[PDB]
């Protein structure tokens, strides 16, 4: 990975790979869904679908080019893919839709066709995708009245008030030269990308992103969306975790790998070395679970999600899981730390070394915006190998022992008890 700032202030990052048969060039901006207010929530989701509209995709398809876009809470990306030897054609396409000509995409015929397509997607998401809308409600109750609680797709009530003047106002404040990184992955080398950008002189004005007033803060709270006509119950639960650039960034990732993932219908996932599986397989308390560790610029979340049809034993599934989190402070063993070291190196080795240059362009550009450089995979492996049992017990006594939680749930969640009997399971009464 090579990073280089040019004479006019453009940051170029490149990860060359000579054994790939494609190349990807794009632009990543450092503003996401957490840079909006509750009135224009959804302008980033509308800018993505304007880029991927049919009249834009038909111009790129005549040259042999494919388009991609991704909206997150801290960044956005607009990526063009081609063959290794058509990389200057994908730079001319990216020039003519972000720099030199943007008023033909925001015509009134193209805007109203795009807006009714996005309104159909958000309506279909809210009635059909139950594990993913419970995790979005967990962000809105844990970080409430703070910028980190807005959903990345927007809401159905906020999207119907957006006009074409809202999209031009968001682009003038956030699509700036001091907020952008030009990325390149696959079969493309660093010097041909720099010389191709420098051939077009690119005036590129000197604005600056608006700064936010409110800092993100965690609050212990809950939200319940009861629906008795659904066949299951979907629950997420979390504490406050680590941000990016934390010293305990990898220790929180190793603690979630100790408890891991589960699928009750796969025979090999029932044989894993996890002590929680002894409690929940006797009466078949759930269908699946997974533990996460999400990290953002300001704060983070650490917890688990689950789905079950055993709706009369929900209180045993929450009680057995939280009693295993207590063991990280008092009685975590040595075999559990050595097993989670090997499975964490396999997990993020498959994340950073897939064969997709579109996935690598998103991970590379999001890291240079925050740190200014990218940590290597060989240096991340030495940090994981130096974690001891005392490092885990010191982290869990600060973040997990007797702390506030955030809960979200939907479906047949009558058997889920109050806040205060789940909150009292965060300590043991033994010690």
């Amino acid at each position: 990975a090579e990073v280089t700032q040019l004479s006019n202030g453009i940051v170029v990052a490149t990860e060359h790979n000579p054994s790939a048969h494609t190349a990807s060039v794009g632009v990543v901006f450092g503003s996401g869904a957490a840079n909006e207010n509750p009135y224009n929530n959804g302008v980033s989701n509308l800018w993505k679908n304007i880029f991927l509209s049919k009249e834009n995709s038909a111009v790129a398809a005549k040259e042999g080019l494919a388009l991609s876009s991704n909206i997150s809470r801290d960044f956005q990306s607009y990526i063009v893919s081609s063959l290794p030897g058509s990389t200057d054609k994908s730079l001319d396409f990216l020039n003519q839709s972000f720099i030199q000509q943007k008023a033909n995409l925001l015509s009134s015929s193209n805007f109203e066709a795009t807006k009714k397509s996005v309104l159909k997607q958000v309506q279909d998401f809210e009635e059909n995708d139950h594990p993913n809308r419970v995790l979005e409600h967990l962000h809105s109750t844990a970080f409430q009245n703070t910028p980190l609680s807005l959903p990345t797709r927007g809401t159905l009530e906020s999207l119907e008030n957006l006009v074409v003047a809202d999209l031009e106002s968001f682009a003038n404040n956030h699509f700036l030269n001091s907020n952008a990184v030009v990325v390149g992955t696959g079969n493309i080398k660093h010097e041909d990308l720099v010389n191709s950008i420098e051939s077009k002189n690119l005036s590129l004005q000197t604005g600056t992103k608006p700064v936010l007033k409110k800092k993100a803060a965690f609050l212990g709270s809950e939200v319940r969306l009861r629906d008795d006509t659904l066949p299951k119950a979907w629950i997420s639960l979390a504490v406050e975790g680590e941000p990016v650039n934390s010293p305990n960034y990898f220790v929180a990732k190793l603690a979630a790998q100790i408890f891991g993932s589960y699928n009750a219908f796969e025979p090999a996932s029932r044989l894993q070395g996890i002590k929680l599986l002894d409690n929940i397989q006797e009466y078949q308390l759930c269908d699946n679970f997974n533990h996460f560790s999400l990290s953002y610029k300001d704060s983070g979340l650490w917890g688990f999600s689950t789905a079950t049809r055993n709706v009369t034993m929900i209180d045993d599934l929450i009680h057995f899981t939280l009693k295993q989190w207590n063991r990280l402070t008092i009685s975590v063993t040595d075999t559990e730390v050595e097993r989670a070291k090997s499975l964490l190196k396999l997990q993020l080795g498959q994340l950073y070394e897939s064969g997709n240059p579109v996935n690598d362009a998103n991970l590379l550009g999001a890291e240079v915006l925050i740190k200014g450089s990218k940590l290597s995979l060989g240096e991340a492996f030495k940090k994981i190998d130096a974690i001891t049992v005392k490092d885990v017990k010191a982290w869990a006594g600060k973040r997990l022992w007797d702390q506030d939680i955030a809960i979200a749930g939907t479906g047949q969640i009558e058997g889920l008890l109050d806040y205060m009997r789940i909150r009292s399971d965060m300590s043991m009464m033994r010690w």
Partner: protein, 93 residues
């Protein structure tokens, strides 16, 4: 064991009400709230609102039974004094 007769209450998960759909609820942890912020306005304004709504159902029956006892107590004191001696002989026959 065998099952028994039907009831109107169940247990957690099958309590026995109607089906619920469309209601959402929100709460906040007790550790995140300021302690005892109802020691002043609830004790003066709200308890006065609960008192005067229900005080005529209690004090109109209480005044009837206290007026009745007070006249019967004062008439018995007259009958056993010196001035009430010829009325005592005729209400005892």
């Amino acid at each position: 064991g065998p099952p028994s007769g039907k009831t109107y209450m169940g247990w957690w998960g099958h309590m026995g009400g109607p089906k619920q759909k469309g209601i959402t609820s929100y709460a906040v942890s007790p550790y995140a709230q300021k302690p005892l912020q109802g020691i002043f306005h609830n004790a003066v304004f709200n308890s006065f609102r609960r008192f005067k709504s229900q005080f005529l159902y209690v004090l109109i029956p209480a005044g009837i039974y206290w007026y009745w006892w007070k006249n019967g107590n004062e008439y018995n004191e007259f009958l056993y004094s010196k001035a009430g001696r010829e009325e005592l002989e005729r209400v005892n026959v």
